Amino acid sequence: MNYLFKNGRYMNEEGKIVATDLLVQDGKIAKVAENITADNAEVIDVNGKLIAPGLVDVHVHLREPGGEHKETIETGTLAAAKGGFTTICAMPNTRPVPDCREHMEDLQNRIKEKAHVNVLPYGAITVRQAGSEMTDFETLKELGAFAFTDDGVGVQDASMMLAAMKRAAKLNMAVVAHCEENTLINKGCVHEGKFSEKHGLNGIPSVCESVHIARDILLAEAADCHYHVCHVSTKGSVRVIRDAKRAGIKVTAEVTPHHLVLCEDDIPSADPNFKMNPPLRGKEDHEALIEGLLDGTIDMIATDHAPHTAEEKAQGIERAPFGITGFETAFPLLYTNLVKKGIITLEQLIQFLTEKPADTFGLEAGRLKEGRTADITIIDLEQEEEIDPTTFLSKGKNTPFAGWKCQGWPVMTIVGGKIAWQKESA
Amino acid sequence: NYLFKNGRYMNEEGKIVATDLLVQDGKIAKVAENITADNAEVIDVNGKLIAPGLVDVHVHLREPGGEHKETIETGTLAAAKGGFTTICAMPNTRPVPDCREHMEDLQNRIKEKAHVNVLPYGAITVRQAGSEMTDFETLKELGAFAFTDDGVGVQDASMMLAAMKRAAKLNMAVVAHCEENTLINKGCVHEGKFSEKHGLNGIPSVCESVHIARDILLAEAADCHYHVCHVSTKGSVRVIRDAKRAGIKVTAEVTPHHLVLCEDDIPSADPNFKMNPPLRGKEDHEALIEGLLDGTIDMIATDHAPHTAEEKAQGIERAPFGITGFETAFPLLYTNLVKKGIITLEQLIQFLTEKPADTFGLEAGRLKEGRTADITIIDLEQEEEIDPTTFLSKGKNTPFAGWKCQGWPVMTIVGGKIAWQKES
Ligand SMILES: NC(=O)N[C@@H](CC(=O)O)C(=O)O
Ligand SMILES: NC(=O)N[C@@H](CC(=O)O)C(=O)O
Ligand SMILES: [Zn+2]
Ligand SMILES: [Zn+2]
Ligand SMILES: [Zn+2]
Ligand SMILES: [Zn+2]
């Protein structure tokens, strides 16, 4: 069947947001213009809501296989659709780790069988993320590996990271890095700053992240490889990436919503829902991440959706696991706390979640263009609504933003024509 | 009491002009043209350069443990001959100066038979093994210049951070040999065209540069003065330039051999061209010259590293890293940088005198009334081939044999006393 979206707003290819209609035909965008007639094709009026390209999240944890209790392929992808995401990229810290033909074939069938949105899985850099033996990069590429990473842990051996970037550069693929120097962790559960001093906890210093970024940038220059930094969080990290870019090194980076909104000062007490890796760092680190997003240093926004069960987070700040849920809070939080505050325009918030991540990794996605697959999401900017964990489709209810009033909520989400999710009132 | 007549020198302005110099009680008494003093021994220099005593912050005297390679006596006598009045001895000896007993023993040998001023470095970790930190407070007290594990890299990042916090509290420098051990690749030379041609294992550039980049950030966090030993890569200069614009207290040095040579100049698998870091690519060499000019590299230091002829005869894979540097330093730099107009004579002098002294907080390297008379007289006119058979250093291991140079020291004074003059 067909669809015709009418009386809606959208971001044009120049920059501005203007009002147009949109025609879908056979899972592809037929026409995009103001006033278009279409018989034998169902009409859907949107009342001035934003017709946005389906959002692209390059940093996600679906947890299955191994941790199906935290999240499953179906629940996560359904929850992702609720956030307006049509293309997500699942990280490889699972049991089994996708480190060979057997595991990547298994993973790719589960996606084919029971995924409401497009899922592109990461291959591991090393086998079982143990960091002593590299995976078969050529085999993983054949079976549709998005890129290479050991997200969860860092690659501690510099020679291994160099060897990985050489192999990756030959295959025209990216090395994506969780940057963490293990000797500098100091058993930390939070940032080493005002909060760690106050509550007498051990802290993770900023240099734990930034020394690896600095290292890898040089290795990536030597290899002629595309290097991408996972969730940046320090002022020093942003500086070294800015320096690298001025020298014309193929380096990119991302930042999370929670890092773009919160810092150590916003943590009310020892609350495990404020505990993630990297942690919420200082006021000056926060201001640098904002400044980095604005000047082109930080290329995109990625959620690092990290679901956990309530009972795991229930125990104390020191014992609880790192991470927060993110799909369902992403666009509302950033429209409310950045766009409405005049920190960034709406045009930019869309671009950071669609065409920027797509362009970085070479995807045909995140653009409402005639000819492309019809991956669309409809967003209501008017209705104020408080974020409620009890009404989350995701099995991970670990969030710090409960009770926060927000606008900019996705109401419908479309995946190649097939409607995957809609809000209860349209 | 000496009176040096009819010489030329670098004034506090910048130009080089005629002057005399009067020395009394081991101090510079006057620096004006046409001095008179009836009961002082006259020394006419005939238009030669009166320079302040040269300062080298990177030296290997080998005693204790390496007596066959060099001694305190022979090493400092070679320094005197090269124009150097203050040298800084590195701590890769046997035993290592890593505690009270070893450091006092080192200072006693210096006091007993050094011909020039020797400021000994202290180790960061015990035996340079990288697992246990030395007592920085005690080593400072007993006269440590700065802290380094030179020879090896500090592989543990938490150790270097801890060391920098400790050194920052005492207002002292962490000086670093930057070498990431997983990237060495069993190399004897640079990984490039030369290693490719002769079928040799090569040390890539990133082996050096990844440590500098790491250390810079650790030094920002610890608010510490951090100094880079013998810089040798394009990317190493870049990261240091980036740090200095950010306001970080990082400084760096370069060797005379890395300023004059690169991989394309190695004629064969000759162990006299084997040092650490190695002689890298054409574009690395250009970036070191570029860095010296823009202020990214603060100084020149020889890394005088003497070895026996028999040790170097073993072949390029088994022979030890390092070349002798004291006796060829100023001649090479003057002939290959100043004559060719790459730097001025003002600059070359400052790179070997007032730059290292100011960077590390030493009253040295300036011709100034009241200061101790650490002086050297340099012949800028006379050409002379570099001949290792005439070297006073036990280290004859050099690649510059037969190179015709100008700018040879002919006399070197240390606190009023003549430590060396040209016996010919
Ligand atoms: N997002 C997080 O805080 N943690 C990640 C792993 C990691 O980032 O180390 C997770 O998957 O739990
Ligand atoms: N500079 C050298 O080539 N060698 C030095 C120490 C070192 O740099 O490894 C030595 O002590 O021999
Ligand atoms: Zn991570
Ligand atoms: Zn992650
Ligand atoms: Zn060294
Ligand atoms: Zn050395």
Q: Domain boundary residue among B330, B349, B365?
A: B365
Q: Kindly tell me the sign of the dihedral angle through the C-alpha atoms of B309, B310, B314, B317.
A: negative
Based on the domain organization, do B69 and B165 belong to the same domain?
Answer: yes
Beta carbons of B214 and A219 less than 8 Å apart: no
Can you tell me the distance from the alpha carbon of A57 to that of B190, in angstroms, rounded to the nearest whole number? 42
Header resolution in angstroms: 2.5
Number of residues that make up chain A = 426
Q: For chain B, which residues lie within 8 Å of any Cβ of chain A, measuring from their own Cβ? A: 156-159, 161, 180, 182-183, 185, 204-206, 209-210, 213-214, 216-218, 220-221, 235, 238-239, 242, 246
What is the Å distance from ligand 1's center to A152 Cα?
Answer: 5
Based on the domain organization, do B375 and B318 belong to the same domain?
Answer: no
Q: For chain B, what is the domain count?
A: 2
Based on the domain organization, do B7 and B87 belong to the same domain?
Answer: no
Q: Domain boundary residue among B348, B365, B382?
A: B365
Based on the domain organization, do A86 and A125 belong to the same domain?
Answer: yes
Based on the domain organization, do A144 and A224 belong to the same domain?
Answer: yes
Can you tell me the distance from the alpha carbon of B23 to that of B18, in angstroms, rounded to the nearest whole number? 17
Can you tell me the distance from the alpha carbon of A300 to that of A327, in angstroms, rounded to the nearest whole number? 15
- Cα end-to-end span (Å), chain B: 24
Measuring CA to CA, how many Å separate A173 from each of A297, B13, B206?
Answer: 21, 57, 21
Beta carbons of A211 and B221 less than 8 Å apart: no
Measuring CA to CA, how many Å separate A84 from each of A77, A255, A380, A384, A422?
Answer: 11, 18, 11, 17, 10
DSSP A163-207: HHHHHHHHTT-EEEE----GGG-TT-SEETTHHHHHTT--EE-TH
- Across the beta sheet with B226-228, what order do the strands follow? B174-176, B226-228, B250-254, B299-300
Pairs across A and B, CB distance < 8 A: 65
Can you tell me the distance from the alpha carbon of B325 to that of B323, in angstroms, rounded to the nearest whole number? 6
Measuring CA to CA, how many Å separate A31 from each of A27, A163, A369, B43, B99?
Answer: 12, 47, 8, 96, 79
| A304 is an annotated ligand-binding site residue | yes
Q: Which atom of ligand 2 is nearest to the CA of B179?
A: 9
| Nearest chain B CA: its distance from A183 CA (Å) | 6
- Three-state DSSP at A343 gives coil
Beta carbons of A218 and B218 less than 8 Å apart: no
Can you tell me the distance from the alpha carbon of B23 to that of B27, in angstroms, rounded to the nearest whole number? 6
Q: Domain boundary residue among A324, A349, A366?
A: A366
Residues 6+ apart with CB under 8 A from B361: none
B85, with CB counted inside 10 A (0-12, 13-18, 19+), is buried
Residues with CB under 5 A from ligand 6 (ion): B 150, 303
Question: How many CB atoms neighbour CB A267 within 10 A?
Answer: 22
Residues 6+ apart with CB under 8 A from B92: B60, B128, B150, B151, B152
Ligand 1 pocket check for A189: Cβ under 6 Å: no
DSSP A141-154: HHTT---EE-TTS-
| B39 is an annotated ligand-binding site residue | no
What is the Å distance from ligand 4's center to A67 Cα?
Answer: 15
Give the number of C-alpha atoms closer than 13 A to the C-alpha of residue B10, restricted to the C-beta side: 20
- Note down the domain range covering A385: 1-53+367-426
What is the Å distance from ligand 6's center to A100 Cα?
Answer: 45
Ligand 1 pocket check for A404: Cβ under 6 Å: no
- Across the beta sheet with A85-90, what order do the strands follow? A55-60, A85-90, A118-119
Give the ligand at the shortest distance from the Cα of A122. 4
Can you tell me the distance from the alpha carbon of B54 to that of B364, in angstroms, rounded to the nearest whole number? 9
Q: What's phi and psi for A83, nearest 5 deg?
A: -80, -5
**Beta bridge partners of residue A229, listed in sequence order:** A177, A253
Based on the domain organization, do A41 and A84 belong to the same domain?
Answer: no
What is the Å distance from ligand 2's center to B155 Cα?
Answer: 17
Helix H, strand E, coil C: the string for chain B is CEEEEEEEEECCCCCEEEEEEEEECCEEEECCCCCCCCCCEEEECCCCEEEECEEEEEECCCCCCCCCCCCHHHHHHHHHHHCEEEEEECCCCCCCCCCHHHHHHHHHHHHHHCCCEECCCECCEHHHCCCCECCHHHHHHCCCCCECCCCCCCCCHHHHHHHHHHHHHCCCCEEECCCCHHHCCCCCEECCHHHHHHCCCEECCHHHHHHHHHHHHHHHHCCCCEEECCCCCHHHHHHHHHHHHHCCCEEEEECHHHHHCCHHHCCCCCHHHCCCCCCCCHHHHHHHHHHHHHCCCCEECCCECCCCHHHHCCCCCCCCCCCCCHHHHHHHHHHHHHCCCCCCHHHHHHHCCHHHHHHHCCCCCCCCCCCECEEEEEECCCCEECCHHHCCCCCCCCCCCCCEECCEEEEEEECCEEEEECCC
Based on the domain organization, do A72 and A220 belong to the same domain?
Answer: yes
Residues 6+ apart with CB under 8 A from B66: B93, B94
Based on the domain organization, do A279 and A133 belong to the same domain?
Answer: yes
**Beta bridge partners of residue A30, listed in sequence order:** none
Ligand 1 pocket check for A322: Cβ under 6 Å: yes
DSSP A195-219: HHHHTT--EE-THHHHHHHHHHHHH
Q: Of the candidates B161, B210, B217, which has its C-beta nearest A218's C-beta?
A: B210
| A242 is an annotated ligand-binding site residue | no
Q: What's phi and psi for A396, nearest 5 deg?
A: -90, 110
Return the CATH number at B244: 3.20.20.140
Return the CATH number at B412: 2.30.40.10
Buried b (16+ CB within 10 A) or exposed e, A337-372: bbbeeeebebebbbbbbbbbbbbbbebebbbbeeee
Based on the domain organization, do B109 and B231 belong to the same domain?
Answer: yes
Based on the domain organization, do B106 and B226 belong to the same domain?
Answer: yes
Based on the domain organization, do B13 and B67 belong to the same domain?
Answer: no
Based on the domain organization, do B320 and B411 belong to the same domain?
Answer: no
Number of residues that make up chain B = 424
